[PDB]
Paper text:
Collagenase from the gram-negative bacterium Grimontia hollisae strain 1706B (Ghcol) degrades collagen more efficiently even than clostridial collagenase, the most widely used industrial collagenase. Collagenase (Enzyme Commission number: 3.4.24.3) cleaves the triple-helical region of collagen under physiological conditions, catalyzing the hydrolysis of peptide bonds with glycine residues at the P1 position. It produces the collagenase Ghcol, which consists of 767 amino acid residues with a single catalytic domain containing the zinc-binding motif H492EYVH496. Here, we report the crystal structures of ligand-free and Gly-Pro-hydroxyproline (Hyp)-complexed Ghcol at 2.2 and 2.4 Å resolution, respectively.
To obtain a homogeneous preparation, we expressed the collagenase module (Ala88–Thr646) of Ghcol with the Sec signal peptide using the B. chosinensis expression system and purified it from the supernatant. The space groups of ligand-free and ligand-complexed Ghcol structures are C2 and P21, respectively. Both crystals contain two molecules (chains A and B) in the asymmetric unit of the cell. In addition, the activator domain comprises two homologous subdomains, whereas zinc-bound water was observed in the ligand-free Ghcol. The peptidase domain is further divided into two subdomains, namely the upper half (C1: Phe366–Val515) and lower half (C2: Val516–Gly622). Comparison of the zinc-binding motifs of Ghcol and ColG revealed that both contain two His residues (His492 and His496 for Ghcol and His523 and His527 for ColG) and one Glu residue (Glu520 for Ghcol and Glu555 for ColG) that coordinate to the zinc ion, and the catalytic Glu residue and one water molecule are located near the zinc ion. In this study, the overall structures of Ghcol and ColG are shown to be similar with an RMSD of 1.56 to 2.38 Å.
Author numbering: 90 to 622
The structure:
Amino acid sequence: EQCDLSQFQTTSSNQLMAAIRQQGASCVNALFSADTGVQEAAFSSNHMYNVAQYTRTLAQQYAGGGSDELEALYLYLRAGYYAEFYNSNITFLSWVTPAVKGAVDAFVQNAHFYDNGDAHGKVLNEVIITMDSAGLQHAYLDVVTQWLTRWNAQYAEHWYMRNAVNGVFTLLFGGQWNNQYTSLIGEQTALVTALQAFALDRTKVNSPTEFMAANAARELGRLARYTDATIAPKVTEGLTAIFGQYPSYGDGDAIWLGAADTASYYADCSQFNICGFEDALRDAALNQTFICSDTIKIRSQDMSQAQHLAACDKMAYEESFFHTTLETGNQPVADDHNTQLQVNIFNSDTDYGKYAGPIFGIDTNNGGMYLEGNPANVGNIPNFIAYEASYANPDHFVWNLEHEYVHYLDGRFNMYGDFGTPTELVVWWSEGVAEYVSRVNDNPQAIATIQDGSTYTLAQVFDTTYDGFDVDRIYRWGYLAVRFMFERHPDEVQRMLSATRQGRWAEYKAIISGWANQYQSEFAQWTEALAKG
Ligand SMILES: [Ca+2]
Ligand SMILES: [Ca+2]
Ligand SMILES: [Ca+2]
Ligand SMILES: [Ca+2]
Ligand SMILES: [Zn+2]
């Protein structure tokens, strides 16, 4: 029943292995995020070697049907390498990894390694991940080829089999930083052939395994970087087959686009005659057009007329509330011709992930993106890009519609020059004002981050960056800092904006560093009255 993490903080391998098998894989999970005290005790080189030896002989005896103990043991072993990476106090001696490779081989060579089934899939998942976590990607290319060859609809029925076998592609990805692997990968013609066939299996399209086919396509495209190798004609032959068999937009385009993403990074699009696919993709994927007004155009993938209307109506609303709150006088900053805005809305975050990168040139591991372009250019039309979501705001249900729209208004009326122009950090303001103008006082997560005990000073908020993408600090605490100033010192907000509206970034920074000294006490008390009321 209950996890007892202290049992793992021990010098006895027997007590350690008793804790693994008796607490099971779900308690061993705690070791990933445990204190450096527990990690250092549990993941000594002695423990790893002894656990690996016992794991090797239990795996030799495996007779199918799954194993909670093996699952927990290989989970432990791969947790050690995780801790070895993140914990400086932890470095494995040279004789550990050969023993871990002994434990993995024992499972690989067991007659049941390629068994089908959900319980088996659970252990298999941990073994395949360990191949990656232990830097052994060079040792199992023939295992990858076997799994790619043997996969079929019967394996596909089990979630844990899909999840486990998908780990071969993470292994091919991880091999890039494995000098044995990159020394070997150029001769693996059988593996390349099996990757081609796996991705080209049309029965995976629109199935629960399509995502595996897309991963196979991606990993294949990475192999185009070995331009001289024995595998190079077959890699090229495989990529050509994928691009010609699947559409860039339609059923299976995740496979097409998966290949395109990596193949373009390591070779040129002209080899496969796919240069400039993004334009036809933009027209096919964003095939609806709705003209809100002469200043806002929507291009969308699949929205209803009612969503279009509610989106137009909501943006017109935010515009007038923005201009009143920011005291713009409707006067844009200088050298900004961004009178017209183009709004691009995909059907879902999945579609955004597939399509927005190529069409717009952006990262898509986020909730949306605003692209100001160059306001000084006559004919510049900025774009924000977003996706429909069930949890978005009715009646449009476009995730971050109001948020991105305020980015456009902020960029045109508060922030001189294009996006990269400032020479000081403006993240707290840009994101804070985008949240505050669009949510005003409805922000439960902002209240929550006050009540949970972890807080930020004004000084820390102003020095916030996108590094690590700390959503709490960026969006919640940016929101609080902005809201606090508009409520308690809106006249100081205008003094700041006099600077930002003229590009005077050093004066802007001197102004808000003054705030971080004057108003910290007032801000601290204010966040408390917010968490109380
Ligand atoms: Ca380390
Ligand atoms: Ca829709
Ligand atoms: Ca601007
Ligand atoms: Ca917090
Ligand atoms: Zn934003």
